[PDB]
A = this chain, B = another copy of it.
Amino acid sequence: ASNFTQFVLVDNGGTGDVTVAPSNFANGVAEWISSNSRSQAYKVTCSVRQSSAQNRKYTIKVEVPKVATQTVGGVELNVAAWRSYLNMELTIPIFATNSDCELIVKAMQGLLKDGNPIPSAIAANSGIY
C-alpha cells in the first residue's frame, strides 16, 4: 500500500487537469511535481513530525506557477513568470482519534468549499467585507 502516489491537484473539468506525481521522499519530506519543465511545474510537499510530547505537526506546501516564456537575447526558455505559495501547518494532539481527525479534515474542506467566504475572497482578489 502507498499514499505516496500521483493525484489530481487541479480538477479543471477532465481536460487540462494538473496531475502531480511523486519525485522525492528525502529526509521525511514527501514531494510531488507536475510533468514537463521543472521550471514550470506545480509542487506539493508534506512532512509530519512530533512537535512536542503531545502534538504531531503536519507541514504542507503548494506552489502554483504562472506559466510563461522568457526570451533573453533571442533564446527562449520555459519559466514561471511568478509563483503563489501556500504554506500550511496543522497541529494535532496525540489524543486525537481517527474520528477526531476526520472532523479536522472536514473542517478544512468546508473552509475552502466553493461559495464560502474565504475561497470567494481569494478567487476575486479580495479580502473580507
Contacts and interface: CB of A to CB of B under 8 A. Distances in A.
Contacts of A82: 54, 75, 93, 95-96
A6 to B, nearest CB: 7
Nearest to A48: B127
Given A1-B5, A74-B68, A98-B125, A86 B90 contact: yes
A45 B86 CA distance: 16
A32 B129 CA distance: 10
Interface of A: 1-12, 18, 21-33, 35-39, 41-42, 44, 46-50, 53-56, 58, 60, 62, 64, 66-129
27 contacts: A2-B129, A3-B129, A4-B129, A7-B113, A7-B115, A8-B110, A8-B113, A11-B109, A23-B48, A23-B124, A25-B128, A26-B30, A37-B94, A38-B56, A38-B96, A42-B107, A48-B126, A58-B122, A62-B107, A68-B96, A73-B97, A73-B100, A78-B95, A79-B95, A101-B123, A104-B123, A109-B114
